[PDB]
């Protein structure tokens, strides 16, 4: 918009992400507004009745979600229809995105906030970030602010977390649901230390095999 150029890009290396399309009835709204203005000019005073509410929504529905979860529908099918389209960082400069469906519903009848797309919030996080539960209730940087700066192990036992996230539908959980007590017990768990149960260790918790390969290959045994 600053300069009138139009750019088409089709090269490799373009990051892209699907986004649900937001449709509205702005044309009908403008037609109704013009009709109401004409009515005012006529002095009939029903112009208020001519105007119609503005509606912006997305074609995604609960049935589509059920089909997606059932495997009937795929992202290719959605893109083939008008539900969603791929957006790149270059084109994202021309997109006004509602960060969640809650925002779209909040501004459903707001002609002042016409949105071009709806974004699922979890889309702003990677798999590693999505592993952590209730990440929005924690400030992950301050967690590491203290920790900032500074041969294969096979573990026998793993369990699904009691509070599972979406990230565990695509990776194998590695860990255990350990009973943690948040208490002061003798001052042996200070400065990020942790007191462990000897029986928990003996029972095989976090026990495994470490493999080191001598593939490349004084007083010594030789016997």
């Amino acid at each position: 918009s600053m300069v009138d150029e139009v750019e088409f890009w089709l090269d490799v290396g373009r990051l892209t992400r699907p986004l649900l399309i937001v449709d509205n009835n702005i044309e009908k709204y403008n037609q109704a507004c013009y009709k109401a203005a004409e009515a005012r000019k006529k002095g009939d005073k029903d112009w208020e009745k001519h105007k119609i509410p503005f509606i912006q929504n997305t074609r995604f529905t609960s049935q589509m979600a059920k089909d997606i979860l059932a495997g009937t529908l795929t992202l290719e099918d959605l893109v083939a229809q008008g539900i969603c389209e791929f957006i790149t960082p270059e084109e994202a400069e021309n997109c006004l995105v509602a960060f969640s469906i809650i925002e779209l519903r909040k501004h459903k009848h707001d002609v002042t906030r016409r949105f071009t797309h709806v974004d699922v919030p979890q889309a702003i996080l990677g798999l590693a970030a999505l592993v952590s539960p209730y990440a929005n209730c924690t400030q992950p940087a301050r967690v590491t602010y203290e920790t900032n700066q500074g041969n294969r192990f096979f573990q026998f036992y793993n369990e699904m977390p009691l509070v599972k996230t979406i990230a565990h539908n695509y990776v194998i959980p590695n860990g255990l649901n350990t009973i943690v007590a948040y208490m002061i017990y003798g001052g042996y768990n200070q400065e990020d230390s942790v007191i462990v149960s000897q029986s928990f260790i003996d029972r095989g918790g976090f026990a495994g095999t470490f493999y080191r390969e001598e593939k490349v290959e004084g007083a010594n045994y030789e016997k």
Binding site: G126, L127, V131, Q155, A167, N174
Partner: peptide
């Protein structure tokens, strides 16, 4: 000869060294 394959291999050897979450993240890195 050996120079082609060995040199391409070496270009891959420099760093570029590969639980499942860590490997998948390294791929996505």
């Amino acid at each position: 000869a050996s120079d082609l394959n060995r040199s391409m291999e070496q270009s891959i050897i420099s760093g570029n060294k590969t639980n499942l979450l860590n490997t998948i993240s390294a791929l996505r890195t």
